[PDB]
Amino acid sequence: PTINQLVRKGREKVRKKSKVPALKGAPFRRGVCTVVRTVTPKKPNSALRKVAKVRLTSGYEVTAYIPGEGHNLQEHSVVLIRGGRVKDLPGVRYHIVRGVYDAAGVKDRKKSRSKYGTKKPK
Amino acid sequence: GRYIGPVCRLCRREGVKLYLKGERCYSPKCAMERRPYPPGQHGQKRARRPSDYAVRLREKQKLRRIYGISERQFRNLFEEASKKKGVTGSVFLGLLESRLDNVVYRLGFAVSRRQARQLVRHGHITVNGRRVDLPSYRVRPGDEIAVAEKSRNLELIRQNLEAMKGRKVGPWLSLDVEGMKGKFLRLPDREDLALPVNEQLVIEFYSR
Amino acid sequence: LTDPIADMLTRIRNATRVYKESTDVPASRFKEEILRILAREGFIKGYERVDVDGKPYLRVYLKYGPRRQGPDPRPEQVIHHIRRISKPGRRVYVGVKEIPRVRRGLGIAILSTSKGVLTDREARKLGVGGELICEVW
Amino acid sequence: PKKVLTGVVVSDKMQKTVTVLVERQFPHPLYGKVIKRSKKYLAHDPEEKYKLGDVVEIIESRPISKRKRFRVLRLVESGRMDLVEKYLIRRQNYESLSK
Amino acid sequence: RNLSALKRHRQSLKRRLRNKAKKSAIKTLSKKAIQLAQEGKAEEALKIMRKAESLIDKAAKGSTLHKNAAARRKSRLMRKVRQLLEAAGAPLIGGG
Amino acid sequence: MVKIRLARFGSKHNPHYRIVVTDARRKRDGKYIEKIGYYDPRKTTPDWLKVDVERARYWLSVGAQPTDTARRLLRQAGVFRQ
RNA sequence: GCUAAUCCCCCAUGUGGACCCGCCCCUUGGGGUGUGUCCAAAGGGCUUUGCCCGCUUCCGGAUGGGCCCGCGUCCCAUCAGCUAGUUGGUGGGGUAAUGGCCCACCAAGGCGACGACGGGUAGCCGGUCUGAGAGGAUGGCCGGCCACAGGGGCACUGAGACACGGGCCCCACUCCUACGGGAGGCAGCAGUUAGGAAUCUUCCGCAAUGGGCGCAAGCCUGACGGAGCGACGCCGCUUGGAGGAAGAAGCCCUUCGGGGUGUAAACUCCUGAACCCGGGACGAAACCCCCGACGAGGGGACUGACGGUACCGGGGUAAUAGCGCCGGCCAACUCCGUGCCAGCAGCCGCGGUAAUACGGAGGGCGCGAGCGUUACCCGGAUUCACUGGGCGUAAAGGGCGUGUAGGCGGCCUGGGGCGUCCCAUGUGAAAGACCACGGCUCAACCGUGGGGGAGCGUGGGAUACGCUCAGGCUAGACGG
RNA sequence: CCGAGGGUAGGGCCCGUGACUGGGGCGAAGUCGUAACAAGGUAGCUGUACCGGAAGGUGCGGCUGGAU
């Protein structure tokens, strides 16, 4: 564009769209589970992935992935959710944080136990 | 704190003797004589072409593992050298050699930098007449690094300075044996050392 | 025509790329003071004030390097680059402290100052700044 | 120093007060181009001696009223009705920007 | 449940009553002399205006009036009597 | 009133006052009119106190009042001498 | 109903000031002077024909402010028109003071695409974070300013407030009560509760600095100085040092010969984090007191919360290690288990019976009292392109004219000097940043010094180019 | 007189929420047909119009980014 156009109109400072809008600018948000269920993933993956539909302290109600093998979550489980989509479960933009509130850790976990609310064993 | 683990696997991974034990490093018992391949299961498997990030990471671990220094300090000291006047490679090396625990080792009060560090942390070393028990203390041109009076009558520095009578310490340094004191004359130039390191690659490492 | 100066910087640029012996420029005083710089600095053999179809022009005598060997024998240019800086759409004024070096001194910058038209090295000699007319190398 | 500006009387339709239209040029803080900008000043004229098209100078004076903080200093040029026409045409052109 | 702030409040009212009392008279004796000047009736206006001058400055002796409030109050008192007496003149006695 | 004061600097268990002329109501470490010296009440370095005596006399001459400790630091600098 | 005073009035004196009308200088209400009028007060202590603290009027200084102006200051135009105290004037009220700040009347104005009005969001700056710079983002700590003190309104006292721990009133809420009635305002310091992913001790002392009052001894000071909790952050330190086999056991791999963990361990010697004992701080010398002169200058005295801590000396035990990762990006690989399941996943992608990608194990890489994760800012992103991008077919030329505002504009001479360039000078607080030096054993932290700008105010100068004004031309353009 | 605010009445903006309703995005292995990509078996695309379960068809005029 001409310099005279830049004077008249300027350059539009781009704005970024958050990927975690349910978090309301917080790192984590507490909620309670309504539906705890399995969901199948999109092509080309096949599985029965465990998610929970969580109603948040920010008024929102979202779905949150339940990572690791085995969980103990059901309806009315108090939970803490974190940022994080699951590329292959469309519409799941959050992860439940293991080992917080009513999400138990992962039994017999030995590697990466910090990412699964599991403590150290003898 | 500093790395207090096995030490021969260090040279084995880097592929060059890092004289980190003192006596044992000059005997046929040095593990770099016997098995000069990386430690662990796959050492004797034939190596692949490493990436250039690998080449620079390796040069930078070699330099750091020489002085037995934590990455935090090694990077702290790098950044002071960077923003300093001009030649970074020389300054990083000179500021590294300016550490008290290192100077204790270069002077010969100790046989290894690990031991040198302990001679300081246990107080056996003074600087210009005061107990200075800080491994990271920055020695400067002029100071006199000695052994404490309540320490000079101790087997270790007696024996250590003995074999030092047979040794000729670096030019930038001074050593009066039997007085058990030395002098830091000036921070080293580039060629004062033939450190098995190309410090230019270390600059290249952090510039990524 | 909207910028007689950029027109002359461009007439010469186009003339040197086809290796023309000379190229005529519509005549003006400010353009002499710029061609004055280009000749003394070696970029052109010089100029003369001529008359084309009754009107005053400026025949600029260009210059080129030696005939080269290989494919494409065409000689390297003596004016590699001649670029307008200050334009009618955006004037560019630098004080003396922010006068640019063109190609680490191997090139020149022509400016207009209250002491006349100078090169970058001439400007700091007289200690004055002005309007950055063009850069050349 | 009391700021002294120079402008033109675009409207004399008030008692003891004229509207002085001042321009100022400066480079764009990012695109460097020189640009014009303008501003109207209600200036004191206790002798109602100044009319349309006068090119006057105003001096920063004590408040005469809300918005009136300048006294007309001296006439510089009389009869510049060409400038007032640039002003009025711009204002008249505003009805064409409506919805 | 106490202070020395309660003493500052008990005192503020002793002073408020005092400051209001002085201002009342200042406005009364002054306006009185301005009506008298309009009639003019000059000896009577000026004999009163002077007591209006005395009360004004005696108020500026303390907190009831700032020096400049009094000087301005005095300025307008006298100024109004002048013009008012310019119609149906005879300024006798004198006070200016 | 203008006062001649010691505005503490330094760090915890590390005092370093500045000899400063500042309003009586300005907060201690707040903006001051002028810095006319400094002070190190432990005397850890060779010159723990210094005073622009010619300036400290000006503010003394124009109204400023010192502290019961700043005064002993201007007498220790002979601002009051004969 | 009684009663004192630095409380309150009256008279007097007028150095003086104020006001009004005159003249003189100056020039917005600045300064002079004359006439008239008007306004001063407070006493207390000791050693006493003497000081001291106080008092009064006026001037000046100094500091702290008020008000006014140029300029700069975010998003939406799917907000385009806004305005009756509204804009100006005369008179007045008001104030320390200008002003529609407020009132009466008069005039018909003021503002707006150079974005008025409206809606959204936001305290602003020194600075901070990033960045090659340009720029972007941000305003917590610290300093300056502003704004508010349960929500609103108001004034009073005063140099100063329309006053957080002052007063009045209305509202919402809460509390005491003997049930008649009364009270309160933590966005002070702790502390409680609620909300939240989340944020501290109902600690110590005025010893220091600083504030208030006082002649002074001193008193008050949740300012402050310190102590407490929190790996929240940065910095420093430890969990050992040297020796020790062609190399134990255990575990992993194996082509069954062996390879690995690994000098790693044990074990030998050396040192001695912690803890035990003794000594023990700097921060604190002034105010006062003596002589002198209640000065100058000498000399004396008492005072430490932190703290019996730092640190010094002497004794002295081998004394926490964990977290992430190993398919490419990207540094580190094998065995087993699982069999599109269970699961992983920042992106590309892994898993369907020989998976370096899931889970465990051996081994390995990276860091280390940390290591990971999530959130957010800048960078990589020349992916809003001023530096520094594009539009035939990748996203991008308006369907085409005409034309307003606006942007931009040929050759020659001169006048001005607006832009622009230069010189001088003022401002650009402290802290921070950067460089040098030094104090805490180092460092972080901190002191002292040094060095700069841009921007704006002012004075002087230059005149090429841009601007303007004036005069001439004919190459553009237009007409015959 | 002004005046916090309370009351009455009528507007404007924004947010949330609503039986039902519109289409939209997405979703390993559903049902219908085969419009487009080759001249895709009627060259395709196109603005508009009208029609048809559905892609689509047809008219008018336009484009070549249409084949031989």
Ligand code: SF4
């Ligand atoms: S003994 Fe050899 S392998 Fe071991 S640390 Fe010394 S030089 Fe390195």
Ligand SMILES: [Mg+2]
């Ligand atoms: Mg798959």
Ligand SMILES: [Mg+2]
């Ligand atoms: Mg809930």
Ligand SMILES: [Mg+2]
């Ligand atoms: Mg449950």
Ligand SMILES: [Mg+2]
């Ligand atoms: Mg994992």
Ligand SMILES: [Mg+2]
């Ligand atoms: Mg060892």
Ligand SMILES: [Mg+2]
């Ligand atoms: Mg970098």
Ligand SMILES: [Mg+2]
């Ligand atoms: Mg980088």
Ligand SMILES: [Mg+2]
């Ligand atoms: Mg400039």
Ligand SMILES: [Mg+2]
């Ligand atoms: Mg009355």
Ligand SMILES: [Mg+2]
């Ligand atoms: Mg008064």
Ligand SMILES: [Mg+2]
């Ligand atoms: Mg401490």
Ligand SMILES: [Mg+2]
């Ligand atoms: Mg102040």
Ligand SMILES: [Mg+2]
């Ligand atoms: Mg009297």
Ligand SMILES: [Mg+2]
């Ligand atoms: Mg108003």
Ligand SMILES: [Mg+2]
């Ligand atoms: Mg009115």
